[PDB]
């Protein structure tokens, strides 16, 4: 069960969710 991780290329995975939360925070920081 040893291989390489690519996290696929579909759905809402990690990092991108953090970038989305950062995008929402930026949306709350630009509208202020």
């Amino acid at each position: 069960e040893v291989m390489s991780s690519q996290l696929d290329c579909d759905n809402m995975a990690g990092v991108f969710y953090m970038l989305g939360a950062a995008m929402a925070l930026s949306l709350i920081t630009f509208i202020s």
Partner: protein, 211 residues
């Protein structure tokens, strides 16, 4: 902004994603090194590839030997014997050479020999389990006092460190090593590729991004 991004990535949210990417890279690099390939080895004589053998897994032993006798006089070893009786070699050397040249899939023999071939050859490894714990002795014609003499001499030999020295100068004298601890050190090939890529990008950068 370019120097900030490339500076944070190569060492607030971007720094978090950078630390997360670095930690994930380290963790994945650890997982792709500490573990190994899917387990594929013989678990001894009780291995399914020997219980019900086929044309895919071919194993045998030395023709007219102690292993041959062992597999002969037994009812539950009928199939294995019937299988080996078509691939047996005349000598041990030809069998070892066969399993070394990928002709055999396995080769049943003495541990004192097979573990010695795993000490003078890194491509040959003994199996997992061990059966038929017998021993080697001195051949004696019928009932002779020389049998008692020799036996007493061997007992006296084991009494001290005679056989220990005989093993340390022949058996324990291993030329190869044991890969029980698989990940010894990091491969220099990967570092060589990394150095090649880094020096390449640095050269192209010094030839383009310079002026």
């Amino acid at each position: 902004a370019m120097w900030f991004s490339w500076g944070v990535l190569l060492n607030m949210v971007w720094a978090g994603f950078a630390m997360i990417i670095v930690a994930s890279y380290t963790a994945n690099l650890a997982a792709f090194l500490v573990l190994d390939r899917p387990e594929e080895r013989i678990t001894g004589i009780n291995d399914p590839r020997l219980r019900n053998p086929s044309d895919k897994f071919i194993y045998a032993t030395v023709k007219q030997s102690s292993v041959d006798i062992y597999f002969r006089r037994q009812v539950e070893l009928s199939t294995m014997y019937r299988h080996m009786e078509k691939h047996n070699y005349e000598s041990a050397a030809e069998a070892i050479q066969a399993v070394r040249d990928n002709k055999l899939h396995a080769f049943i023999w003495d541990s004192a020999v097979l573990e010695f071939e795993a000490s003078q050859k890194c491509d040959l490894v003994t199996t997992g389990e061990l059966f038929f714990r017998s021993g080697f002795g001195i051949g004696m014609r019928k009932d002779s006092p020389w049998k008692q003499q020799v036996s007493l001499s061997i007992l006296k030999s084991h009494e001290n460190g005679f056989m220990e020295d005989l093993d340390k100068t022949w058996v324990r004298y291993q030329e190869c090593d044991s890969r029980s601890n698989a990940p010894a050190t990091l491969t220099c090939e990967n570092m060589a590729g990394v150095f090649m890529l880094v020096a390449g990008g640095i050269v192209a950068g010094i030839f383009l991004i310079f002026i």
